[PDB]
C-alpha cells in the first residue's frame, strides 16, 4: 500500500513570491504525480512567505526530484527538503563491533549518495577499533533518507545510525 504521506512531502524553500500553486506543481510535477502542492501565504494579505510543500505519490517521486536539484522555481534557485523525522552531512553510524572496515560502509552509504569523508573510531589508547563510525556526505538529502529508514544492516550487524553534529 502507499506509503506514509509524511515521507513523499518535499517543503520548498527560498520561492520566489511570485511562485503560485499552479506554478510550483508546474515545475514539480516533471518528476511525479503529485497528490498536493501549496505555496505559504499570509492570511491577510495573501503575499507569498516564500516557501511552500509539494506531496508526491510516492517515495521513488521524491527521490527523483531531489535527484534533479538544484532546482530554479519561476527564476529563482529553490531549497527543497524531506519534511521532518537539523539539516546536517553526517551521520554516526554505531554497532559495526570490531570486524567493520571501510569498504562495508563505503559500499553500503554509497547509494544513499556521495561518501566524502569514513572516519573509523579507534581507541585513542589502544587502537582497537571501538564499533562505531562517521560517514560525511557531500550533501544532506543522504542523511535524510538514511535516518528515515527502521534498519541498517552492514556486515551482517543491525546498526543505529542518527544525525551527527
Ligand atoms: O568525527 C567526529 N567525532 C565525534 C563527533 N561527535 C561530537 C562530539 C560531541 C557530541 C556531543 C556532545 C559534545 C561533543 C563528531 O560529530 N564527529
Known sequence: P?????????????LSFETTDESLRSHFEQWGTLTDCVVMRDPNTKRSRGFGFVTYATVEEVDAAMNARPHKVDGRV??????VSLTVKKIFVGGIKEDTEEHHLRDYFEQYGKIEVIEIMTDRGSGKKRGFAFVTFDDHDSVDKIVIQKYHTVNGHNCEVRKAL
Request: aromatic content about 6%; hydrophobic content about 30%.
Open 78 to 83: 529553490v531549497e527543497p527538503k524531506r519534511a
Open 2 to 14: 502507499k506509503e506514509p504521506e509524511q515521507l513523499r512531502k518535499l517543503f520548498i524553500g527560498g
